[PDB]
């Protein structure tokens, strides 16, 4: 959810005004469905499992 | 007690009556509001104050 769709995480100060702070994935990451492989979990054993 | 007061040097201390209305100032004063209107922050905005 948060690479593909992007996740609101919390608040930021700008200019003294309270703005939204958002992850998601870069542009080039996110377009194909072969993109979906590039994005690895980590599991309990500490290694990352596509 | 303005008279007694005035000499207390540790606070700054006053005494006064009770208004007829309490939303109802003075008819001579004025009630001004310095907005801070670009950004500027707060200690800008204490600045132009002074």
């Not at chain 1, 608040?11 to 702070?21: A, P, Q």
């Not at chain 2, 007061?5 to 309490?22: C, E, H, R, T």
């Amino acid at each position: 959810g948060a690479a593909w769709g992007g996740s609101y995480v919390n608040d930021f100060i700008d200019r003294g005004r309270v703005k939204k702070v958002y992850i998601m994935s870069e542009a080039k990451y996110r377009m194909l469905p072969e993109d979906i492989g590039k994005w690895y979990v980590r599991g309990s054993d500490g290694q990352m499992v596509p | 007690a303005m008279g007694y007061f005035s000499q207390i040097k540790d606070a700054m201390v006053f005494a006064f009556n009770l208004p007829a209305i309490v939303e109802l100032g003075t008819a001579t004063g004025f009630d001004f509001e310095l907005i801070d209107q670009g950004g500027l922050g707060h200690e800008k905005l204490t600045q132009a104050r002074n």
